[PDB]
Amino acid sequence: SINQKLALVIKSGKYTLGYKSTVKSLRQGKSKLIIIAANTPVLRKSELEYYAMLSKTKVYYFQGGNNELGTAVGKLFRVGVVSILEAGDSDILTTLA
Amino acid sequence: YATVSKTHKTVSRAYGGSRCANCVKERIIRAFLIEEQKIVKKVVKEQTEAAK
Amino acid sequence: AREITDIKQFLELTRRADVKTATVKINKKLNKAGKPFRQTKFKVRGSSSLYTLVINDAGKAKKLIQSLPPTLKVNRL
Amino acid sequence: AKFLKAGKVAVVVRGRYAGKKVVIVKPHDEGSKSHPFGHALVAGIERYPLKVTKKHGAKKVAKRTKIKPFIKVVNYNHLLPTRYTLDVEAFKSVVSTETFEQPSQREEAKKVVKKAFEERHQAGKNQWFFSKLRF
Amino acid sequence: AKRTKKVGITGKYGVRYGSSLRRQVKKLEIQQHARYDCSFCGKKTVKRGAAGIWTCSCCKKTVAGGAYTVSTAAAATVRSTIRRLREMVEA
Amino acid sequence: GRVIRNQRKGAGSIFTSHTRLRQGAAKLRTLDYAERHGYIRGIVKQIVHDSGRGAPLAKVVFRDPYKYRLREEIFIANEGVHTGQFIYAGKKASLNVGNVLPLGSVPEGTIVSNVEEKPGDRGALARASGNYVIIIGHNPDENKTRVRLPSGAKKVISSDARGVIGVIAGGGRVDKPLLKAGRAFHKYRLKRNSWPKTRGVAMNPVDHPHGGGNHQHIGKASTISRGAVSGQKAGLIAARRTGLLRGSQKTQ
RNA sequence: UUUACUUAUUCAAUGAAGCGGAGCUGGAAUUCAUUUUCCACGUUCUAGCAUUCAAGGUCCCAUUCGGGGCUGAUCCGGGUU
RNA sequence: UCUAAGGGUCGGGUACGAUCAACUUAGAACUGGUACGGACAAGGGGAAUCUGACUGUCUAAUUAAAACAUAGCAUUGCGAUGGUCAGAAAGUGAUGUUGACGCAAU
RNA sequence: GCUUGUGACGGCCCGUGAAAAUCCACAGGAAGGAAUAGUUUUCAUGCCAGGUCGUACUGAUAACCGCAGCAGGUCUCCAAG
RNA sequence: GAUGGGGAAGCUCCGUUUCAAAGGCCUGAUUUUAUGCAGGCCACCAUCGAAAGGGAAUCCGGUUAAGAUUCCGGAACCUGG
Ligand SMILES: [Mg+2]
Ligand SMILES: [Mg+2]
Ligand SMILES: [Mg+2]
Ligand SMILES: [Mg+2]
Ligand SMILES: [Mg+2]
Ligand SMILES: [Mg+2]
Ligand SMILES: [Mg+2]
Ligand SMILES: [Mg+2]
Ligand SMILES: [Mg+2]
Ligand SMILES: [Mg+2]
Ligand SMILES: [Mg+2]
Ligand SMILES: [Mg+2]
Ligand SMILES: [Mg+2]
Ligand SMILES: [Mg+2]
Ligand SMILES: [Mg+2]
Ligand SMILES: [Mg+2]
Ligand SMILES: [Mg+2]
Ligand SMILES: [Mg+2]
Ligand SMILES: [Mg+2]
Ligand SMILES: [Mg+2]
Ligand SMILES: [Mg+2]
Ligand SMILES: [Mg+2]
Ligand SMILES: [Mg+2]
Ligand SMILES: [Mg+2]
Ligand SMILES: [Mg+2]
Ligand SMILES: [Mg+2]
Ligand SMILES: [Mg+2]
Ligand SMILES: [Mg+2]
Ligand SMILES: [Mg+2]
Ligand SMILES: [Mg+2]
Ligand SMILES: [Mg+2]
Ligand SMILES: [Mg+2]
Ligand SMILES: [Mg+2]
Ligand SMILES: [Mg+2]
Ligand SMILES: [Mg+2]
Ligand SMILES: [Mg+2]
Ligand SMILES: [Mg+2]
Ligand SMILES: [Mg+2]
Ligand SMILES: [Mg+2]
Ligand SMILES: [Zn+2]
């Protein structure tokens, strides 16, 4: 599933976590896909969306809170947004997403 | 406050001595996006009307 | 109520239309750690502030006093 | 792309010029012994052209349409890159690193940039850029 | 060291009012002082501030809720009822 | 004898409401052109305790359609509504907790609060913490809507009368024992001067029908007629039955 | 006696603001000659912004700066609802 | 009259030193006409019966109580064109800035 | 250390603990403004004026109320070893 | 607690923004002239009620038989112009 694809990304690719860095990543044309927590406030969501479209980057809307997004990336804190810099051995990039 | 010069009652930004700055960051961002999404909203329903 | 330190600024004060009177006070005081030395405070009374200028150098002191406007009503001590 | 480049319009988001709109004229994507941050060199509009109408005649229009410009070194993280873009060739040379340092160099620059923007504005190229963002 | 065998917070009333009244109060006190999950920012930082008012330490949103608990059974069934009924109208 | 306690209440000298800390009266918007042809948006700005009340109030602000300014309104907050939330009021509004719609626009089964008894009266029914009314049917000809009040009563009102979706916040307030006299003290200190309460059976005859006797006791039936007279109505007024209620109540 | 009416009387509301009747357009709708009708007829991802008789259009004053009409904002009835 | 325990501040390449300033607590000697919380200050205790649960309250000036109150329990009225109450009357008034998780009455 | 002030926090509530005058700020951009010289009194300095009534003392085992220079009653601030 | 009002034989009782045609500011228009009209607003509809609540601004030293943050000396500050 999407989490298992995520979990592959995490253990074989490159990624950054959290608002500020995925904007650095978005500016630098580096992000290959961003994943957005169900409950991040619409304004941030709106902005990451504007940053993404300016950089021709695809967005995924994670069915679930920042609490669970962080468990999906195998981490014990919570994350509101994720940036794939490199699909590792996974295929998240070229599947449904 | 009437006994005291204007620079003691402002900071030199938009909404100076009134709103809090991180508050004005928010206002600006939200304004821009919403004014943009407005053009987005219009062009969709201009398209709905001609594809119906 | 107000202190002053620019010895040019001061001279201008003393000639400011509203400045009728002034006073000069002399204070024994001690230097660094050891010896003493003669301190002098020039006080110019303006309409709403008493401006006072402290000259520690007894030498600038003497010369300054000669520079005092010859119509001003100085109070010595 | 690396979308922060040679002609991007952006909204300033912090500090005095906050909320005003700029063009990037020269990007410093990473580095500077001074400014240790990604930062752009922008020319923006500080005092916008006030609106003008049919009632406005003679030299009231002339007054109404004056533009006060500004130039700024500003950290990337304080700009909202915009989808719009405005051509920057007529004052490429003018907004320089050397332009900052020495006030007199700054004032000269704005003189040019101001003449540039008032040209642009009359016969309304870049229409959006000359109308105040409200918030 | 476990300090009380069963009166918990209700220890403060000593011996007064009858064990069963203290039982009833204990339940709603635990309910009412507890820290809750914020729906909006996802931190557990919603504490009460006078019956029905529930507000978040950071992020600072306030949510009208039950007198002693953020969400009421009744409130919640109603929330889904409304949901169900709403969805009939654009469907 | 003398005027009894329940007659003195009416002149309300020391019996008026303790009103100083109150936030102001809770009311829906005035029923204007907006609310009655379309919808109008506000923002809940603040949800706040009102002394003497159980349910919190929600301060909600709307633009004035006819003048440049903000007009603030005092709602009773429904469970679930929150600061920053957008509130939609009007005929053409949509079925969300917090919005305010005329009962004619909401399907049978809808749950609502603060509903009007006539359109525009700005809200009368189901305001106390936890309460609500259920819509149980419509009669589109002569637009009426049948609802069921907290009390159990059914009543039909105009389909234009308005209501706000959901239940009033603060529920279960009464599940918790007061425990001490003092909490009732502070309870009634912010309401009105009705506490504590001497039993009439502890007063003298001058004072009350129940007063007097060499043992405490009422000495005649304590169920009093409807058509009894001021000074006589103490006890179980117009009581159609009496005694421990046995078995399921529940309006059928 | 029933059940209709509204101007008496009665109750609420609002700084008496958008009522009633028609018309424009969109269209569901099915045409038994062509329309017989019924609905609509600017706002819902976001804790921004919304005011100077409105910009636009158009006609005047005798071209000065200023300023006015109409339109933008359909018509009719003055029953505030 | 002794002993022990409990702290501060400083320089240390990318183990300790130096000093200054506080009554607490415990242990050990000695000592006296066996005294020493030396004045002051400062709970009598126990076992049961009756009775009100408690805290609170009253008869100012013969009754402080087992009386009143109280939380808790139960019953009654009422959806506003209403219930309870006020007023000689009223385009009058209390509850009511209220609405059954409410107000009023036992 | 003692008294008082104050801060950052924490406990409590079916209790969540006034109002108005008044002062400022911001959004707005009507307007009014320069080169042969304009704008500026929220920067400094400078000029004039500020009426009317109370103001002593006691505040208690003698200045108050208890028929009184009554062992009674009568609100409060300061506080050494 | 006045007032348009409504009761009351009446002394008066009710009501306080109430079922009222409820009033004044900013400058422009004057260069007969002193202030008529020209805009646009603002509809807030009395007033009394705190010497402990709110609140513009002063201090030190000296001085009397008896006054003093009030006089004298010095040095400040606020409000209006
Ligand atoms: Mg400042
Ligand atoms: Mg500005
Ligand atoms: Mg009252
Ligand atoms: Mg009482
Ligand atoms: Mg009792
Ligand atoms: Mg009782
Ligand atoms: Mg008795
Ligand atoms: Mg009797
Ligand atoms: Mg009887
Ligand atoms: Mg009896
Ligand atoms: Mg009995
Ligand atoms: Mg109306
Ligand atoms: Mg030691
Ligand atoms: Mg007892
Ligand atoms: Mg007791
Ligand atoms: Mg007695
Ligand atoms: Mg006793
Ligand atoms: Mg006694
Ligand atoms: Mg019992
Ligand atoms: Mg009448
Ligand atoms: Mg004290
Ligand atoms: Mg608080
Ligand atoms: Mg301020
Ligand atoms: Mg004009
Ligand atoms: Mg000044
Ligand atoms: Mg005067
Ligand atoms: Mg005195
Ligand atoms: Mg005496
Ligand atoms: Mg005495
Ligand atoms: Mg009166
Ligand atoms: Mg007064
Ligand atoms: Mg006072
Ligand atoms: Mg005072
Ligand atoms: Mg003195
Ligand atoms: Mg004298
Ligand atoms: Mg004296
Ligand atoms: Mg003096
Ligand atoms: Mg002087
Ligand atoms: Mg002045
Ligand atoms: Zn939160």
Swiss-Prot record, chain A:
Keywords of the record, alphabetical order, are: Cytoplasm, Isopeptide bond, Ribonucleoprotein, Ribosomal protein, Ubl conjugation
Family the entry assigns: Belongs to the eukaryotic ribosomal protein eL30 family.
Task: Name any one Pfam family assigned in the record.
Answer: Ribosomal_L7Ae
Q: Which organism is it from?
A: Saccharomyces cerevisiae (strain ATCC 204508 / S288c)
What else is on record for this protein? Answer: Present with 59300 molecules/cell in log phase SD medium.
Tell me the GO BP annotations in alphabetical order.
cytoplasmic translation; negative regulation of mRNA splicing, via spliceosome; rRNA processing
Cite the location of the cross-link Glycyl lysine isopeptide (Lys-Gly) (interchain with G-Cter in ubiquitin) from the record. 14, 45, 75
Which InterPro entries does this entry report, sorted A to Z? Ribosomal_eL30-like, Ribosomal_eL30-like_sf, Ribosomal_eL30_CS, Ribosomal_eL8/eL30/eS12/Gad45
- Please give the function described in this protein's UniProt entry: Component of the ribosome, a large ribonucleoprotein complex responsible for the synthesis of proteins in the cell. The small ribosomal subunit (SSU) binds messenger RNAs (mRNAs) and translates the encoded message by selecting cognate aminoacyl-transfer RNA (tRNA) molecules. The large subunit (LSU) contains the ribosomal catalytic site termed the peptidyl transferase center (PTC), which catalyzes the formation of peptide bonds, thereby polymerizing the amino acids delivered by tRNAs into a polypeptide chain.
Q: What GO MF annotations does this protein's record show?
A: pre-mRNA 5'-splice site binding; RNA binding; structural constituent of ribosome
Taking the first listed entry, what is the main subcellular location of this protein, grouped into a coarse class? cytoplasm
GO cellular component terms, A-Z: cytoplasm; cytosol; cytosolic large ribosomal subunit
Give the superkingdom in one word: Eukaryota
The question of whether Ribosomal protein is a record keyword is answered with yes
The protein's name? Large ribosomal subunit protein eL30
- Organism lineage string: Eukaryota, Fungi, Dikarya, Ascomycota, Saccharomycotina
Q: Where in the cell is it found?
A: Cytoplasm
Curated annotation (Swiss-Prot), chain B:
What cellular component GO annotations does this protein have?
cytosol; cytosolic large ribosomal subunit; preribosome, large subunit precursor
- List locations, semicolon-separated: Cytoplasm
Report keywords, A-Z: Cytoplasm, Ribonucleoprotein, Ribosomal protein
Quaternary structure and partners? Component of the large ribosomal subunit (LSU). Mature yeast ribosomes consist of a small (40S) and a large (60S) subunit. The 40S small subunit contains 1 molecule of ribosomal RNA (18S rRNA) and 33 different proteins (encoded by 57 genes). The large 60S subunit contains 3 rRNA molecules (25S, 5.8S and 5S rRNA) and 46 different proteins (encoded by 81 genes).
Other notes: Present with 23600 molecules/cell in log phase SD medium.
Name the protein family: Belongs to the eukaryotic ribosomal protein eL34 family.
Name-wise, this protein is Large ribosomal subunit protein eL34A
Provide the species name: Saccharomyces cerevisiae (strain ATCC 204508 / S288c)
Q: What residues of the intact protein does this structure contain? A: 62 to 114 of 121
Swiss-Prot record, chain C:
What's the miscellaneous note? Present with 50200 molecules/cell in log phase SD medium.
Subcellular location per the Swiss-Prot or TrEMBL entry: Cytoplasm
Assembly mode? Component of the large ribosomal subunit (LSU). Mature yeast ribosomes consist of a small (40S) and a large (60S) subunit. The 40S small subunit contains 1 molecule of ribosomal RNA (18S rRNA) and 33 different proteins (encoded by 57 genes). The large 60S subunit contains 3 rRNA molecules (25S, 5.8S and 5S rRNA) and 46 different proteins (encoded by 81 genes).
Domain of life (superkingdom): Eukaryota
Keyword DNA-binding listed = no
Name the chain's protein.
Large ribosomal subunit protein eL38
Major localisation: cytoplasm
Q: Does the keyword Zinc apply?
A: no
PANTHER family named among the record's database cross-references: 60S RIBOSOMAL PROTEIN L38, LARGE RIBOSOMAL SUBUNIT PROTEIN EL38
Q: Name one GO molecular function term.
A: structural constituent of ribosome
User: What family does this belong to?
Assistant: Belongs to the eukaryotic ribosomal protein eL38 family.
UniProtKB/Swiss-Prot annotation, chain F:
Note whether Ribonucleoprotein occurs among the keywords.
yes
Name any Gene Ontology BP term: cytoplasmic translation
List keywords of the entry alphabetically. Cytoplasm, Isopeptide bond, Phosphoprotein, Ribonucleoprotein, Ribosomal protein, RNA-binding, rRNA-binding, Ubl conjugation
Q: Which InterPro entries match?
A: NA-bd_OB-fold, Rib_uL2_dom2, Ribosomal_uL2, Ribosomal_uL2_C, Ribosomal_uL2_CS, Ribosomal_uL2_dom3, Ribosomal_uL2_RNA-bd_dom, Translation_prot_SH3-like_sf
- What are the GO cellular component annotations? cytosol; cytosolic large ribosomal subunit
Single annotated GO MF: structural constituent of ribosome
Q: Where is the signal peptide?
A: none
- Return the PROSITE patterns for the record: RIBOSOMAL_L2 (PS00467)
Q: Where in the cell is it found?
A: Cytoplasm
Q: Where is this cross-link: Glycyl lysine isopeptide (Lys-Gly) (interchain with G-Cter in ubiquitin)?
A: 45, 92, 118, 144
A single Pfam family, by name? Ribosomal_L2
Name the SMART domains for this protein. Ribosomal_L2, Ribosomal_L2_C
- Positions carrying Phosphoserine: 51, 94, 158-159, 248
Q: Mostly located where?
A: cytoplasm
Concerning its family, UniProt says:
Belongs to the universal ribosomal protein uL2 family.
Q: What is the documented function of this protein? A: Component of the ribosome, a large ribonucleoprotein complex responsible for the synthesis of proteins in the cell. The small ribosomal subunit (SSU) binds messenger RNAs (mRNAs) and translates the encoded message by selecting cognate aminoacyl-transfer RNA (tRNA) molecules. The large subunit (LSU) contains the ribosomal catalytic site termed the peptidyl transferase center (PTC), which catalyzes the formation of peptide bonds, thereby polymerizing the amino acids delivered by tRNAs into a polypeptide chain.
Q: What other facts are recorded?
A: There are 2 genes for uL2 in yeast.
Q: Can you say what this protein is called?
A: Large ribosomal subunit protein uL2A
- Which species is this record about? Saccharomyces cerevisiae (strain ATCC 204508 / S288c)
Source lineage: Eukaryota, Fungi, Dikarya, Ascomycota, Saccharomycotina
* Gene name per UniProt: RPL2A
